[PDB]
Amino acid sequence: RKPPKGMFLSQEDVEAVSANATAATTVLRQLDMELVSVKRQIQNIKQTNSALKEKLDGGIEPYRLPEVIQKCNARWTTEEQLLAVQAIRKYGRDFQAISDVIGNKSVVQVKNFFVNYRRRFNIDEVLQEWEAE
Amino acid sequence: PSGVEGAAFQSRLPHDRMTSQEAACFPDIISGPQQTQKVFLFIRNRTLQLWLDNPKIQLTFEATLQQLEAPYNSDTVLVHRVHSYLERHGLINFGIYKRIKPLPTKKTGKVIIIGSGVSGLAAARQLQSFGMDVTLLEARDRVGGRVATFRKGNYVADLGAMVVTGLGGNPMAVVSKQVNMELAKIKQKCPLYEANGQAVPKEKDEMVEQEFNRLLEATSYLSHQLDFNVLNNKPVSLGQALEVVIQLQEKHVKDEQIEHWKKIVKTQEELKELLNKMVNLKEKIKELHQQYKEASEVKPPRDITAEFLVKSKHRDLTALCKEYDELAETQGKLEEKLQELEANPPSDVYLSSRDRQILDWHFANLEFANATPLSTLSLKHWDQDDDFEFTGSHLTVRNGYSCVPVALAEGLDIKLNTAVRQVRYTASGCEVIAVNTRSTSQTFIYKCDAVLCTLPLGVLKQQPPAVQFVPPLPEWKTSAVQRMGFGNLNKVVLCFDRVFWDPSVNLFGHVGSTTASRGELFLFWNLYKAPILLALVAGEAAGIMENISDDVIVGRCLAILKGIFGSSAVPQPKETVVSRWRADPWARGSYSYVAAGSSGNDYDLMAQPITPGPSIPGAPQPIPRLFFAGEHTIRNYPATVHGALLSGLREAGRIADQFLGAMYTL
Numbered sequence A: 001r002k003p004p005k006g007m008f009l010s011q012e013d014v015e016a017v018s019a020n021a022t023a024a025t026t027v028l029r030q031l032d033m034e035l036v037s038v039k040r041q042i043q044n045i046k047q048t049n050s051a052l053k054e055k056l057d058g059g060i061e062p063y064r065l066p067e068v069i070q071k072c073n074a075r076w077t078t079e080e081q082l083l084a085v086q087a088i089r090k091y092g093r094d095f096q097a098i099s100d101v102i103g104n105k106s107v108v109q110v111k112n113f114f115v116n117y118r119r120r121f122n123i124d125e126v127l128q129e130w131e132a133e
Numbered sequence B: 001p002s003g004v005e006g007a008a009f010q011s012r013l014p015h016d017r018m019t020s021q022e023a024a025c026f027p028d029i030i031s032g033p034q035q036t037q038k039v040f041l042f043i044r045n046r047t048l049q050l051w052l053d054n055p056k057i058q059l060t061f062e063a064t065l066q067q068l069e070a071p072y073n074s075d076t077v078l079v080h081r082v083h084s085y086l087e088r089h090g091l092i093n094f095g096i097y098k099r100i101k102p103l104p105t106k107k108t109g110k111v112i113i114i115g116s117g118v119s120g121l122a123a124a125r126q127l128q129s130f131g132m133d134v135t136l137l138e139a140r141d142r143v144g145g146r147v148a149t150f151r152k153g154n155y156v157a158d159l160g161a162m163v164v165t166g167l168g169g170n171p172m173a174v175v176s177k178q179v180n181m182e183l184a185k186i187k188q189k190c191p192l193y194e195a196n197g198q199a200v201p202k203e204k205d206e207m208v209e210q211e212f213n214r215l216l217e218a219t220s221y222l223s224h225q226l227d228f229n230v231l232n233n234k235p236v237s238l239g240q241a242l243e244v245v246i247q248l249q250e251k252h253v254k255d256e257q258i259e260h261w262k263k264i265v266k267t268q269e270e271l272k273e274l275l276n277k278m279v280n281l282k283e284k285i286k287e288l289h290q291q292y293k294e295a296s297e298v299k300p301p302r303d304i305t306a307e308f309l310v311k312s313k314h315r316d317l318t319a320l321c322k323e324y325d326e327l328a329e330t331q332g333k334l335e336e337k338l339q340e341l342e343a344n345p346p347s348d349v350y351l352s353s354r355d356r357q358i359l360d361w362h363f364a365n366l367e368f369a370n371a372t373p374l375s376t377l378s379l380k381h382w383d384q385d386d387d388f389e390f391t392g393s394h395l396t397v398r399n400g401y402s403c404v405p406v407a408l409a410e411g412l413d414i415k416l417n418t419a420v421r422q423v424r425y426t427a428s429g430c431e432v433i434a435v436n437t438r439s440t441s442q443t444f445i446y447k448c449d450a451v452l453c454t455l456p457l458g459v460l461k462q463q464p465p466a467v468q469f470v471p472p473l474p475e476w477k478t479s480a481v482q483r484m485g486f487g488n489l490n491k492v493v494l495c496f497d498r499v500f501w502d503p504s505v506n507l508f509g510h511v512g513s514t515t516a517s518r519g520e521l522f523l524f525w526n527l528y529k530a531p532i533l534l535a536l537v538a539g540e541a542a543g544i545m546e547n548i549s550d551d552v553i554v555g556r557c558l559a560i561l562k563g564i565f566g567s568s569a570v571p572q573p574k575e576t577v578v579s580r581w582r583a584d585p586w587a588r589g590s591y592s593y594v595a596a597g598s599s600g601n602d603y604d605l606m607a608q609p610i611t612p613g614p615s616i617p618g619a620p621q622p623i624p625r626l627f628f629a630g631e632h633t634i635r636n637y638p639a640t641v642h643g644a645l646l647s648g649l650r651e652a653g654r655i656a657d658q659f660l661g662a663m664y665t666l
């Protein structure tokens, strides 16, 4: 029912190798060529990747900023409100970003702000304005 | 297998079942109740046991009946029938044994046997035993035919048959108890030495042999599952199949190499895309930092938009730096996934040049076994007789195989140096025309009731013919003759005055440089009492070497040996003999093989007797007159000594049945 383990023999392949007197030689050469074709394709990409790596030399170390570690506060100071309003204008409903920007207000506190100051800060007008971009 | 069951097995019979031949002679029994069949089988097995227990004396009906116990010894006709049946078919009382009942003084019928090889000799002994007048015509100046032994001083070496392939079920086992045969086991260890003279490590040897077996198994799959048995209206040969299988394995090695390097590019490409993202992201980060730095220049106190700008740019910068760290994490994964693939390549080749040479040694070995190049063997039937192999270890005849035919010749009427030229067979008898090989003009005429032809297949193929049949043989027979293969293999006997080789090693191989020459002196045998080495020439090399002088052949042998054991160790041989079976006009080859386009059915056709037409218009259908025996006429055991012996036993029984009548069939 089966070839020995590791031995490969398909109806399709036998036909190909026995189609003519030199069918086998043709099959094997066309494969030798596909191989060279793939190897040069490898060296090519290797060469390109090597150049791209050379551009990332140094990584992003000189561009990193210290972290602004500050505890989360309950009350909203005028400064914070104004930061929020602008944050909403730039980010929209990305509460994480808005929280990060304000620095001392958690995600929930920000979500709440959206409801509590909805009328006073024309949050509806601001959101529709973020949508225009 | 022991007891009465052992006897059946030793006679190549199923112990619990009646054969087709037995059905024909005992139709009453095989068509009757199971119980009676069991009685018959026991009588048959037991009769065989008595004979096998002591093959040195004639087993008579009286002797048989006396040694049987109740209730079997009560049906005397059934016992007598079984006995005559076995005797007639050569299953008992064959070979050389002391005769109890003397031979009938006046004989019945005349039979001429062409050839005195084992098949001819075995048939003659039988016919003589049955009471017929028998004469053998032999072309050579000796008996034995393809069983030929070289004898000079103490040197003894077989140029023909040499191996007894297991005693389990082999009729030669009986012969070996009757004749002074000195059987010696053949140790199977066989080191191989490459052309450079250095030995092949255990590891290679085993790996290559396993592959060789795997490739044979593969051709069998190609035959029974893909039905690859006809290519361009031509029957496929074993050779062709192997070439296809090997090419497919080479293809697979390249298919795997391709898929391996394609996984590298795919990954290598994913890396490119990731690096591109990283480079663009680094630009954005570079830019944002600059903007953040500029925003930080507007020093406080500053309005809330200025503060927003600083805080906003800060957040955007951190977010992007987080994206970069994630991509850098992915870069390390892809980079290592590449060092992994680069380190795990698939195989470079299916078989190296060295591996191929060692593999060719195995093919040469198969070419030797079948006495023919692999490109001539039928893919479908080359191994049609594998299921009939005997059990036990292979042996060699230490005192020379010729001891068998020489012994079988005792008491027979043999005309040596008598070459048959023409065989005439008619409705009332035959006439054989032969000449004296020492002076061809001298002619002999032999008239007889029947002719048993044991001419080798090689001779039967001779064109134009060496022996003319009048009337010509029919097409069904001649076509079988044309279709069957008739191989060749040769031996080079090297007689030395000392032992420079390993005495505990029975055989060793020489691995050729090219496929073309794989069979050239590929194997050496160390086998007799004297210091002798026997070299084999197989496959395509057999035919070609026949055109090379002994000196050049021997020179090559010595060169090989010097390369293995050292230049100073190998002396000049004291005596050398080189066989040339193809050129031998009385053989024209070594033995038959199942050629591509042939099948086991051709062996049956070779076996069918010929019946001449009537001499007189309207006269009844004659008796068969021309019979055939020989190695090429026995489907289950062709190309062997036991096969030839069995073929003779068969024809003797058929001839005797035809001309003496059968009293056991009623």
Ligand SMILES: Cc1cc2nc3c(=O)[nH]c(=O)nc-3n(C[C@H](O)[C@H](O)[C@H](O)COP(=O)(O)OP(=O)(O)OC[C@H]3O[C@@H](n4cnc5c(N)ncnc54)[C@H](O)[C@@H]3O)c2cc1C
Residues within 6 Å of the ligand: B114, B115, B116, B117, B118, B119, B120, B137, B138, B139, B140, B143, B144, B145, B146, B147, B159, B160, B161, B162, B163, B164, B165, B418, B419, B420, B421, B454, B455, B456, B459, B466, B467, B489, B490, B581, B585, B586, B587, B589, B590, B591, B629, B630, B631, B632, B638, B639, B640, B641, B642, B643, B644
């Ligand atoms: C080199 C070699 C190695 C072998 N190895 C083995 C082996 O290891 N083990 C094994 O079991 N078998 C082996 N065989 C096969 C074995 O030798 C034969 O199968 C068997 O001996 C042949 O028996 P035969 O009676 O059919 O033919 P033969 O022995 O050939 O008998 C035919 C006879 O007819 C004679 N003859 C030919 N033409 C004429 C004519 N015109 N007129 C009168 N007579 C004629 C011949 O001289 C010959 O004597 C080997 C054969 C050879 C050649």
Ligand SMILES: [Cl-]
Residues within 6 Å of the ligand: B159, B578, B579, B580, B581, B584
């Ligand atoms: Cl010879």
Ligand SMILES: [Cl-]
Residues within 6 Å of the ligand: B148, B159, B579, B580, B584
């Ligand atoms: Cl010879």
Ligand SMILES: [N+]
Residues within 6 Å of the ligand: B190, B209
């Ligand atoms: N071997």
